[PDB]
Structure formats: structure tokens, C-alpha cells
Scaffold this active site. Sequence first.
Site, short mmCIF file in Angstrom:
data_model
loop_
_atom_site.label_atom_id
_atom_site.label_comp_id
_atom_site.label_asym_id
_atom_site.label_seq_id
_atom_site.Cartn_x
_atom_site.Cartn_y
_atom_site.Cartn_z
N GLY A 38 0.76 -1.23 0.00
CA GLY A 38 0.00 0.00 0.00
C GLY A 38 0.80 1.29 0.00
O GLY A 38 0.44 2.24 -0.67
N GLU A 39 1.87 1.33 0.77
CA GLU A 39 2.63 2.55 0.95
C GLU A 39 3.37 3.02 -0.30
O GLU A 39 4.04 2.25 -0.97
CB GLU A 39 3.58 2.39 2.12
CG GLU A 39 2.88 2.04 3.44
CD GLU A 39 2.27 0.64 3.46
OE1 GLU A 39 2.64 -0.20 2.62
OE2 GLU A 39 1.42 0.38 4.32
N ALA A 40 3.26 4.31 -0.58
CA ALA A 40 3.80 4.89 -1.79
C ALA A 40 5.30 4.77 -1.86
O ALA A 40 5.85 4.50 -2.91
CB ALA A 40 3.39 6.34 -1.90
#
Length: 196
Positions: free
Chosen positions: A104-106
Site C-alpha cells: 500500500g505505501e507509496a
Amino acid sequence: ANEGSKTLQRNRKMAMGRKKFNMDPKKGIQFLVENELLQNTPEEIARFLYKGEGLNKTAIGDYLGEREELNLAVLHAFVDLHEFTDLNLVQALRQFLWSFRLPGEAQKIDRMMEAFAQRYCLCNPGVFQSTDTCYVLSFAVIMLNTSLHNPNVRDKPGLERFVAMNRGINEGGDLPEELLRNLYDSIRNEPFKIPE
């Protein structure tokens, strides 16, 4: 004797190691490493991830995307396991994204796709003049996939639009339309399939 008995315990601990990894990647690897089931080297950890047997693909994605020095080293060893020479971008991407699920984390995705782009350009030195072009184009393919194949997204990028949004990214120039079309067709005809 001991060896047979040892092999049995090793195999079960390995399995346990795999379950631990799926719960919390760093802990799994640490259990495996401490029990000498796995050498604590970037290459050997990456090979373990690449083989993927019994591994939750979300977990693998989580591990490979971590900021920590070792995780970064593993990520680079992992993409180095891939041979992308003369694959087109979509084929290469398809293979890369099969072995994990994006986090999920960019920041995590960023590092992962940057490692992918560097490897692809290394394997296909004539194709791109910069990793930036490869990166951006890789995300265009990913977005096109999502744009095409998500019900929520309501107007499909046609070939004409796809070609349009990617103007100027090839070192201020464009990609050959024929390349863009091949990519477009590849994606339209065989969409990226979420990993199992």
C-alpha cells in the site's frame, strides 16, 4: 541417523519459518536465519522470496519494499534474479508482479518499481535512455490495466488517449507509437492478474 532426524526438524522449522514470514516478514526471516535454515545474505534471502513456496505474496511485497538496508539489498538481488532481456515492458512487468503483491505505501512501491526499472534498462540497454522513462511507462501500463479493468473507472483509455498521456517522457521525445500499441494490446488482451 542424526542427519535424517535433522532433516525432518529442519523441514518443519522451515515450514514454521514460512508461516512466521506470512505473519511478519522480518520475523520470519530472522527465525529462518537464526536457525541456519537460510543464510542471512541479500542473494539467499532474495532467492527464498523468488521461489515463493508457501509464501504469502502480500508479505513478500511488504518485505521487499522496506526502507532498511538489508531489505533494499534483497530487493536489488531479487530483481537481479529476473532476466528481462528482449522481453517487452508488459511481459517483464507481468513476470515481476507475479512473484509478489504491491504494498500500500507509496514509498515502498516507489523503491520496488525503481528497482524494476533499473533492471529492465540494464537488460534492454538499447530501449530506454533513462530509468525515468521506464518507470513512468511502467506505471502507465499499470494504470491502463487498472483503468481498463476496474468497474469504478468509467471511461476507458483508448489507444489514442494512452499514446497521448505518454507524450514527452522519452527524454523529451515520445515512444515509438508501435511500441505503445504493442503495450496497449498486450495489456488489453491479457490483463495483469492478481497474484495467487
